[PDB]
Each structure stands twice: as structure tokens, then as C-alpha cells.
Amino acid sequence: DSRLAEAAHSSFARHETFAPRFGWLHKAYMQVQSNPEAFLADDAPVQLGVGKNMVYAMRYWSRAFKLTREHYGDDTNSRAMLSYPTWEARWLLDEDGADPYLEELGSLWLLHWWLLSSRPGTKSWAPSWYVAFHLAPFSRFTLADLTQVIVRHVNLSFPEGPVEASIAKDVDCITKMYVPAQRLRGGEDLLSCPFRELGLMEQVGQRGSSEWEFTSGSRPSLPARIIAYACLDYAARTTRNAGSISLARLANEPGAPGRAFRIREADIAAALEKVAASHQELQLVEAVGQRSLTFTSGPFDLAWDVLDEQYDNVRSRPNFPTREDWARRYPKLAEAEKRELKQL
Amino acid sequence: DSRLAEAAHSSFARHETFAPRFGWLHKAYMQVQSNPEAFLADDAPVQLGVGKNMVYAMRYWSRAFKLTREHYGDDTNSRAMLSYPTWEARWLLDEDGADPYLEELGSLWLLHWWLLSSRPGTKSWAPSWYVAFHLAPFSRFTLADLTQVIVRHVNLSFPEGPVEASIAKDVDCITKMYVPAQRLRGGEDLLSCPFRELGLMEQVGQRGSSEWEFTSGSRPSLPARIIAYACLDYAARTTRNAGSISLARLANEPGAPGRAFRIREADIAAALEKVAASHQELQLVEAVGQRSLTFTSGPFDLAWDVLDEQYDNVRSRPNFPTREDWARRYPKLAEAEKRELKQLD
Ligand SMILES: [Mg+2]
Ligand SMILES: [Mg+2]
């Protein structure tokens, strides 16, 4: 088994037991935009306004949410892994972007998709999150049961061999990231975490009992265009031209929006139907008779047409850079992608 | 039944049913700091980064959370109410301040207290919230129930009166502010609201059914210094000298922390023990045999010692302004307070 090795980097507990914070995403984008050394400077804890271990966590979460890519010097400098903002970060978090203050719940659903997402050249930095949402056998678990599940997947997927204590720390942090704070004990310490608003995870049988579970209701906070974006972005993992993808695969394949968002096939179809009605190039077709999503040109570009429309077409704004503008401004983003590729 | 009139201004539905947004608090502070006309300018939507239909909601929430005050400018033959940031906003929301990005849940508890709080010279801007937390005789309700208890309290307090439709909009907004996003139904519509993390309101018994309730469990996200601040801030409403206030009043009196935070007397007692252990001027006393909190000096200054401690003593940082420094930069803050105090005929 190497579903996981093919989708995720070997990366555990680099969040340093810290769940994401809005202030960290915001401040990381602002500093890194003009300073590649913003996380590595001896200056960082005061320049970022956080403790020293929070600097690394900030750096990790930037990487994990696909808001930055890392690559060496030179100009020398060193082997130092400097950070570079992605075009998606410029699109989302810029003061001129889609949702710089994460006012819309669809933006959190989007960031959640990027944390789990993977494609050739760009794997996930949260293998424990990927196992939990895409590969775990059961919806209810103890933290030690889920920990054991990830250990077994890491053992069959990576040459290194599992660090149980680090994987246990991922499981603590998943819990803090998705579960309501009333189901947490803080020895006051308790921090906000905006991904709790997604309602993806709950305590069970609350003593609080030792068990936790992922939910399975409807997702009124998940916008249709966010589902449609993820389905077309998932289709674009393997195709760059016109074509189709079955709804069954979108609902059930590991990596796809059904498991990422924990939504049923019917909720995917309902989102795609609503979005298709506004986009001539997209249709739901019932074949033999299973439903398929069709697209008359490459699905990556249509994905971003649907996503940009959810935020009133950010790419139309004055002086908004194109991906090709961004790539020339930050050529190391492509170089980081290439070195991921030349392992395949 | 003048309780609501003494506690709250006659202000209903000015938020247009938009629940608070962190970006709204943060950007309004960044702009009002240097521009008293931030909410009135032709270019407000672009400079505040919001739609034209959101500017007033944003202006309202800043005032309601005691983050701004409003007063006429120095501009003759003009009645427009200009905005000025409060010292509390400088302490909390500045990049140099306590929690500019609302990273700690105690900051949301605190903002919630500010929304509900009331003092001679600074009443609440959220009468429907005041009624819902402090005056309603029940805790479980349909939205039509909550609307009608507010309507009943408003007719006793404000002759002028909003229309019922305005109060209903307040109640929709109360719901979206506090209940989990999974209980709401949009058109996509749903916005984040960080006050939902406080776990204060939940859907109950549904189907159908149409019921809601304020919750009543334990509050592990409510820090003890936040409780003690509110208790001392509450005592300071009526006294500026050494004195005392009973735990029963703190836990049960309308306007006090027990009803604002929906916590029981023992939870208040436990928070106050923790804080009195580091504060020799605070004590929990047994009298006959009711417990009281006592303070050997003025409660308001002790309140802010306790609150500033929760955030690592922000007032000690280099160049942090005193309230005297701030009142000289923004003289109309005191003018807006004096205006309201002389409405207390
Ligand atoms: Mg480390
Ligand atoms: Mg308006």
C-alpha cells in the first residue's frame, strides 16, 4: 500500500502541537510577500510577534495550506529553505484578495481542501490529516485508535518507519482543529480555531468520553461553487483537456471531495447541477445510468472560473497578477514543483 | 419596569441582520484611528473593503462593542455623527494590543461582555441582546417567543418603539451570532462568526419544532480573570471606593456576569478564588453565610489590573497610551460621555 506515499510528504508534528490561527495565516502572508527569510531570521519571533516555536508552526501551516512553497538559495545565503508565497495565497489572503479576513465559511472549506489536496508536483503536507479523512476505516475512534491507524499506514508507505509520538501529536491537533472548544480541557489557555465552524468532528458520549467521530450531516455552510471547484480541481489531477469524471468517483475515491468534505453523492450532484446552470461548459449527464460531470475544456481552468466567481472575480481587479506573472516574480515556485516531480 | 431603559439605548436592527465579523472590527479600528469620517465618506466601501450595504452594520458593531464613540465634529452647521476609537479598542485591537486577531477565546467572552454592559454614561447599544440575556424569564424559546418578550419589555421602556419587524431582525441576528453554523440555512450565504465558539446558544428538539435555547453547561473557554474582571467591572457601575458585592448578585442579578456568561454561582466562586489567590486586595468572604467578593480599593482600577494581567500587562509596553494620553488625542470621547451623562437629568 502506497496511497499515502503517493499523496503526502513525510511530515509529522511540525505544527508543534498548534492548531491553525487566523492571525498566523494573515501575518505569514504579509511578511513573506517581500521577505523570503521571514521565518528563518533570528529576528522572527519579534517581527512576527509570536513565540519561537510558534514561528515554525506558522511556517508549517503556510506550507501545509499551500500558501507558500519552500526552496533553497542561492543567491547565497545557504541551504536555507526560504519561503515564497503561492499565487493562491495572493488570490485569497491579500488585502485586495478574495477573502483576506476569512469572513466566508466557504473560504475555510477551501483552505481545508488545500490542506488535504494533492497532485503530481504538489503533495499534501499533512499525511495524518490525509489518512484520517481519506483512508481511515472507521468514523468513530479513540485518539489512540486513530493514532494506530496512521502508524500502520505510515509503516507501509514510507521507508523511514513511524514516529508514534509525533503521529499522536497530529491526532491531538486534528481534534483541536475541528472539534468545538467546549469539548477540550485547558488546565486561560483556550485558543480560537476557525475550522471548528465546519462542524466536521464531535466528541462522543460526552463524559467527555474517550471517543470522537467525524460527522455526516448536511453542510449548509459549504457553497456549491466550492464543491464544484474541488471536483474540477480533482479531475484536473489527471487530465488537462475536455472530458468527464463519474460522480461515484467524486463521492468515494480517496482524495476526492466526498471524503474531504464528508458529503454524499447526492449533495455533490446538487452542487454541480446548481453550478452547471451558470456555466455553459459544464453539465451533469446521466449515462448507463450513472451521473457524470463533463467539461468542454480543461478542468483546472474551469475550476478557477467557478472559484473566482464565488468571490466576485478577483482576477479582474486592477493590477491583479496572473499565474505567469507570479511565476516570473517567484521562479523558485516552479523549481520546487520540478524537484517534487523528478522523484516520480 | 424601567430596567431596559436605564441599561440600553433605543437601537434596533441597525446591523441589518449582519452578525459581527472579525474583519469588520479590525478594519474599522484601523481606519477610524485616523479618520473620524471613515463610515460617512463617499469612498467608504472601498477604503473599508466592504459592500455599500455593509458600511452601516460595520459602523454599528464598532459602537455596540464599545470600540468607538460618536459625536458631532467641530464642523459648523453639521449634524453628522463622527466616530472615534475608544481606549478599550486601542488596548485590545491595536497590533501592539492585547489580542488584535482575537486568537484567544477570552477576548470573545470579553467582547460579549462589552456588548451587554452598561454604566452611567455608556449604555448598551443592543437592547434586544440585553433583554435576551438579562431580562427574559425563560431560556428555551421559538424565535417568535423571544421576539414577543422583547416587544413586551420595549413597550414598557421606550414610548417611541421600533416596529416588531425590527425586533424580529435583532432576534435573527442573535441566532446567527451564537448558534453553530450547521443550524443555519442560507441561499453561498453563510458567514463566519467567531462568537459561535462560545457555545452559548443551540438548536433544541428540532424537526420541524422551531426551538432554541441558551446553553447551561461548563465553560472551559471562559478564563477566570475574564470572570473576575466582569465582576469588578459590574461592581464599579455603582461604587468607586472599597466595598463588596455578593456572589448571589453576581450570579443572578440582571446585567451581572452570571446572566451574561450563563455561568452558575459556584463557577463564579471558583474563578474568583483563583484570582484572589494572586490579589491580596481581593477576598471571598462568608457573611451570614452568603459569600461576597470584597475589594480594598476602587473596583474599576482593580478590574483593569486583573484584565491586563490576562494578556501579559499590555499597559506596561513601551509607549502604550494612558487613558489620559488617549483623551487628549481624541477629546470628543469625553464629550460623548458628558453628553450622555446629562441625559441622566
Ligand atoms: Mg520541531
Ligand atoms: Mg445600509
Does A210 share its domain with A239?
no
CA distance A159 to chain B (A): 38
Cβ–Cβ gap A192/B191 under 8 Å: no
Find, among A327, A322, A298, the residue nearest to A308 by Cα. A322
Q: How far apart are CA B298 and CA B279, in angstroms?
A: 14
Query: What's the CA-to-centroid distance between A16 and ligand 1, angstroms?
Result: 6
Last residue of a domain, one of B214, B242, B276: B214
Does A49 share its domain with A194?
yes
Handedness of CA B82, B83, B87, B90 (dihedral sign): negative
Does A180 share its domain with A286?
no
Written as nine digits, the cell of A241 is 483537456
Neighbours of ion ligand 2 (CB under 5 A): B 53, 56
| Strands (DSSP E) found in chain A | 68-71, 82-85, 140-142, 201-203, 211-214, 243-246, 282-286, 291-295
Residue A322 three-state SS:
coil
Q: Is omega for the bond preceding A75 within 30 degrees of 0, making it cis?
A: yes
Q: How far apart are CA A162 and CA A143, in angstroms?
A: 16
Q: How far apart are CA B155 and CA B129, in angstroms?
A: 16
Which residue from A minimizes the CA distance to B46? A96
Instruction: Confirm whether B320 is domain-assigned.
Output: no
Q: What is the dihedral of CA A193, A210, A157, A15, to 10 degrees?
A: 30
Closest ligand, as measured to the CA of A14 = 1
Written as nine digits, the cell of A116 is 488535504
Q: How far apart are CA A293 and CA B239, in angstroms?
A: 69
Cβ–Cβ gap A221/B196 under 8 Å: no
Handedness of CA B74, B75, B78, B80 (dihedral sign): negative
Q: How far apart are CA A27 and CA A85, in angstroms?
A: 12
Amino acid identity for residue A140 in this structure: R
Instruction: Confirm whether B338 is domain-assigned.
Output: no
- By DSSP bridging, strand A211-214 and strand A201-203 are antiparallel
Instruction: Confirm whether A323 is domain-assigned.
Output: no
User: Exposure of B170 by Cβ count < 10 A (0-12 exposed, 13-18 middle, 19+ buried)?
Assistant: buried
Whole-Å CA distances, B72 to B77, B84, B169, B178, B287:
10, 11, 29, 34, 49
Residue B286 three-state SS:
strand
- Residue located via cell numbers 481606549: B87
DSSP state of B52: G
Cβ–Cβ gap A188/B21 under 8 Å: no
Triad B169, B20, A260: Cα angle to 5°: 105
Instruction: Confirm whether B323 is domain-assigned.
Output: no
Q: Is B132 left (phi over 0), alpha (psi -120 to 50) or beta?
A: alpha
Spell out which residues of chain B touch residue A102, defining contact as CB-CB under 8 Å: 22-23, 192
Determine phi and psi for A207, rounding to 5 degrees: -85, -30
Buried b (16+ CB within 10 A) or exposed e, A6-27: ebbbbbbbbbbebbbbbbbbbb
Does A87 share its domain with A26?
yes
CA distance A47 to chain B (A): 12
Residue B83 three-state SS:
strand
Q: How far apart are CA A199 and CA B182, in angstroms?
A: 7
Find, among B284, B306, B305, B280, the residue nearest to B293 by Cα. B284
Spell out which residues of chain B touch residue A103, defining contact as CB-CB under 8 Å: 21-23, 191-192
Q: Which residues contact B276 (CB under 8 A, 6 or more apart)?
A: B282, B283, B284, B293
Written as nine digits, the cell of A219 is 453542510
Secondary structure of A152-194 as H, E, C letters: HHHHHHCCCCCCHHHHHHHHHHHHHHHCCHHHCCCCCCCECCH
* Domain assignment of residue A285, given as a range: 224-312
Triad B256, B257, B263: Cα angle to 5°: 130
Does A248 share its domain with A180?
no
Residue A237 three-state SS:
coil
Helices A299-310 and A224-235, packing angle to 10 deg: 160
From the CB of residue A81, how many other CB atoms can be counted at a distance below 10 Å? 16
**CB contact A206 to B (< 8 Å):** no
How many helices (H) does chain A have, and how many strands (E)? 16, 8
Does A133 share its domain with A166?
yes
Instruction: Confirm whether A68 is domain-assigned.
Output: yes
- Residue located via cell numbers 463566519: B192
Spell out which residues of chain A touch residue B197, defining contact as CB-CB under 8 Å: 180-181, 192, 196-197
Q: Is A49 left (phi over 0), alpha (psi -120 to 50) or beta?
A: left
Does A143 share its domain with A289?
no
Query: How is B105-130 classified by DSSP, letter by letter?
Result: HHHHHHHHHHHH--BTTB-BS-HHHH
Does B104 share its domain with B235?
no
Q: What is the dihedral of CA A163, A168, A174, A177, to 10 degrees?
A: -110
Does B197 share its domain with B105?
yes
Q: Which residues contact B63 (CB under 8 A, 6 or more apart)?
A: B69, B70, B83, B125
- By DSSP bridging, strand A243-246 and strand A201-203 are unpaired
Does A12 share its domain with A142?
yes
DSSP state of B242: S
Which residue from B minimizes the CA distance to A195? B192
Instruction: Confirm whether A321 is domain-assigned.
Output: no
B293 touches B46 (CB < 8 A):
no
Q: How far apart are CA A224 and CA A178, in angstroms?
A: 21
Instruction: Confirm whether A167 is domain-assigned.
Output: yes
Q: How far apart are CA B225 and CA B313, in angstroms?
A: 13
Expressed in percent and rounded to 5, the helix, strand and coil fractions of chain B are 50, 10, 40
Q: How far apart are CA B64 and CA B28, in angstroms?
A: 13
Q: How far apart are CA A106 and CA A277, in angstroms?
A: 20
Q: Is omega for the bond preceding A208 within 30 degrees of 0, making it cis?
A: yes
Cβ–Cβ gap B194/A192 under 8 Å: yes
Query: What's the CA-to-centroid distance between B52 and ligand 2, angstroms?
Result: 7
The tally of domains found in chain B comes to 2
Closest CB to A101 among B26, B182, B185: B26
Does A207 share its domain with A253?
no
Spell out which residues of chain B touch residue A50, defining contact as CB-CB under 8 Å: none
Q: What is the CATH number of the domain that holds A261?
A: 1.10.10
B269 touches B228 (CB < 8 A):
no
Q: How large is the C-alpha radius of gyration of chain B?
A: 20
Does B159 share its domain with B51?
yes
Triad A193, A195, A198: Cα angle to 5°: 140
DSSP state of B322: P
Closest CB to B105 among A100, A104, A181: A181
Find, among B242, B270, B245, B247, the residue nearest to B258 by Cα. B247
Q: How far apart are CA B333 and CA B63, in angstroms?
A: 12
Find, among A192, A168, A170, A171, the residue nearest to A182 by Cα. A192
| Strands (DSSP E) found in B38-129 | 68-72, 81-85
Triad A33, A39, A44: Cα angle to 5°: 105
Cβ–Cβ gap B223/A182 under 8 Å: no
Whole-Å CA distances, B288 to B247, B281, B291, B292:
13, 22, 8, 10
Q: Is A281 annotated as a binding residue?
A: no
- Residue located via cell numbers 488535504: A116
Written as nine digits, the cell of B120 is 452611567
Q: Which residues contact A340 (CB under 8 A, 6 or more apart)?
A: A120, A121, A122, A123
Q: Is omega for the bond preceding B319 within 30 degrees of 0, making it cis?
A: no
Last residue of a domain, one of B168, B194, B214: B214
Last residue of a domain, one of B214, B244, B272: B214
Instruction: Confirm whether A322 is domain-assigned.
Output: no
Q: How large is the C-alpha radius of gyration of chain A?
A: 20
Whole-Å CA distances, A245 to A74, A238, A285, A294:
42, 10, 10, 7
- Residue located via cell numbers 480533482: A234
Written as nine digits, the cell of B196 is 459561535
A260 touches A230 (CB < 8 A):
yes
Q: Which residues contact B316 (CB under 8 A, 6 or more apart)?
A: none
B226 touches B106 (CB < 8 A):
yes
Spell out which residues of chain A touch residue B25, defining contact as CB-CB under 8 Å: none
